[PDB]
Design an enzyme around this catalytic site. Structure first.
Site, short mmCIF file in Angstrom:
data_model
loop_
_atom_site.label_atom_id
_atom_site.label_comp_id
_atom_site.label_asym_id
_atom_site.label_seq_id
_atom_site.Cartn_x
_atom_site.Cartn_y
_atom_site.Cartn_z
N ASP A 92 0.81 -1.21 0.00
CA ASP A 92 0.00 0.00 0.00
C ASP A 92 0.84 1.26 0.00
O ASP A 92 0.66 2.15 0.84
CB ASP A 92 -1.00 0.04 1.15
CG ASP A 92 -2.03 1.14 0.98
OD1 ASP A 92 -2.36 1.47 -0.19
OD2 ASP A 92 -2.50 1.70 1.99
N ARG B 255 0.21 9.10 1.49
CA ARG B 255 -0.37 9.09 2.83
C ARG B 255 0.45 8.18 3.78
O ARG B 255 0.49 8.38 5.00
CB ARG B 255 -1.81 8.58 2.76
CG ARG B 255 -1.89 7.17 2.16
CD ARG B 255 -3.28 6.56 2.13
NE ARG B 255 -3.31 5.27 1.44
CZ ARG B 255 -3.88 5.08 0.25
NH1 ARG B 255 -4.46 6.09 -0.37
NH2 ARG B 255 -3.84 3.90 -0.34
N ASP C 30 4.04 1.78 7.63
CA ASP C 30 3.14 0.66 7.39
C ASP C 30 3.72 -0.52 6.60
O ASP C 30 2.99 -1.45 6.27
CB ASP C 30 1.84 1.14 6.71
CG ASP C 30 0.71 1.41 7.71
OD1 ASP C 30 0.93 1.35 8.94
OD2 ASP C 30 -0.43 1.68 7.25
C1 LIG Z 1 1.05 15.01 12.01
C2 LIG Z 1 1.87 13.77 12.36
C3 LIG Z 1 3.16 13.73 12.83
N1 LIG Z 1 3.53 12.47 13.04
C4 LIG Z 1 2.50 11.70 12.71
C5 LIG Z 1 2.49 10.20 12.78
C6 LIG Z 1 3.66 9.26 13.02
C7 LIG Z 1 4.92 9.57 13.42
O1 LIG Z 1 5.40 10.67 13.69
N2 LIG Z 1 5.70 8.45 13.47
C8 LIG Z 1 4.94 7.36 13.12
C9 LIG Z 1 5.28 6.00 13.03
C10 LIG Z 1 4.30 5.12 12.65
C11 LIG Z 1 2.99 5.56 12.37
C12 LIG Z 1 2.65 6.92 12.46
C13 LIG Z 1 3.64 7.84 12.84
C14 LIG Z 1 1.44 12.46 12.32
C15 LIG Z 1 0.10 11.93 11.84
C16 LIG Z 1 0.22 11.39 10.46
C17 LIG Z 1 -1.03 10.67 9.93
O2 LIG Z 1 -1.77 10.01 10.72
O3 LIG Z 1 -1.23 10.74 8.69
#
Ligand SMILES: Cc1c[nH]c(/C=C2\C(=O)Nc3ccccc32)c1CCC(=O)O
Length: 283
Positions: free
Chosen positions: A144, A148, A162
């Site tokens: 995927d 995003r 992911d």
């Molecule tokens: C604004 C923002 C800053 N950081 C994140 C998320 C994540 C992050 O910083 N590290 C990760 C490792 C695994 C899964 C998600 C994250 C978001 C949200 C991103 C989202 O859900 O699309």
């Protein structure tokens, strides 16, 4: 319950849990500060299960962690930092990407958060092709790849997320929409979308789609096109139009990533060299 792994465990008192990150796409993730990893705090993202989580949910999360352990580190992928698995909730500590995902990152810099240059954009492509190349070298099929699922650190380093995710492909609902309202089947290669055959080649197809998004600054693929209409487009060999403000060369790269025959698509190793060359020649 969970077996001990001295190689990754961190004492719970070393993780100061903070504010929730995102709206739930990558499950329940929260920002946190890890003391040590002894007198320095490191901002990290922590993946955990929800209250009503099922044992299946627990299994998959453990699977994703073991997966990250086997795969190893790389600058262009979200790396595992540690875990709190004993006497409490399973906490999977991974790298923090302050600027969030790429889709929104690109959208936020569209001209009416400063504008990105052609080199900045081609450089985004390169970094993702690199995260993917390493993942492929480690025998990992993402399934995927999309803007995003690419996160951006405060230093603008693109990281694939992911990749170690657990998922029964023979359970994927083709009508389920992304949190943003899109249909994931739009990133799927025909053979994956139709014959459920995921390979490094179908990931390359997805990379072509991810390239498109970059060059349209968070552009939505096939706007207004529903699942059944999508199938029909693919059956008829339809390819998206070249984004404005995109060279013929980079469009050709997209077209090659979308080759009808998988064996004919370029590899990530190939795209990395091509993108490396282009970046250098890009204004
Ligand atoms: C604004 C923002 C800053 N950081 C994140 C998320 C994540 C992050 O910083 N590290 C990760 C490792 C695994 C899964 C998600 C994250 C978001 C949200 C991103 C989202 O859900 O699309």
């Amino acid at each position: 319950e969970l077996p001990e792994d001295p190689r990754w465990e961190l004492p719970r008192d070393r993780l100061v849990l903070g504010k929730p990150l995102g709206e739930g796409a990558f499950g329940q993730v929260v920002l946190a500060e890890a003391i040590g990893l002894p007198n320095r705090v490191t901002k990290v993202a922590v993946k955990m299960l929800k209250s009503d989580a099922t044992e299946k949910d627990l299994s998959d999360l453990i699977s994703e962690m073991e997966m990250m352990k086997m795969i190893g580190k790389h600058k262009n992928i979200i790396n595992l930092l540690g875990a709190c698995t004993q006497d409490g909730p399973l906490y999977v500590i991974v790298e923090y990407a302050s600027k969030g995902n790429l889709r929104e990152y690109l959208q936020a810099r569209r001209p009416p958060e400063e504008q990105l240059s052609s080199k900045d954009l081609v450089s985004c492509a390169y970094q993702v092709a690199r995260g993917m190349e390493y993942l492929a070298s480690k025998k990992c099929i993402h399934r995927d790849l999309a803007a995003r699922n690419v996160l951006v650190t405060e230093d603008n380093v693109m990281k694939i997320a992911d990749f170690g995710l657990a998922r029964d492909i023979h359970h994927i609902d083709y009508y389920k929409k992304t949190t943003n309202g899109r249909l994931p089947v739009k990133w799927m290669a025909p053979e994956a979308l139709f014959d459920r055959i995921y390979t490094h080649q179908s990931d390359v197809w997805s990379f072509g789609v991810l390239l498109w998004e970059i060059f349209t600054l968070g552009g939505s693929p096939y706007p207004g096109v529903p699942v059944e209409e999508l199938f029909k487009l693919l059956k008829e060999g339809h390819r998206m139009d070249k984004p404005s403000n995109c060279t013929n060369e980079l469009y050709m790269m997209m077209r090659d990533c979308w080759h009808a025959v998988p064996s004919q698509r370029p590899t990530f190793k190939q795209l990395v060299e091509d993108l490396d060359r282009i970046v250098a020649l890009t204004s």
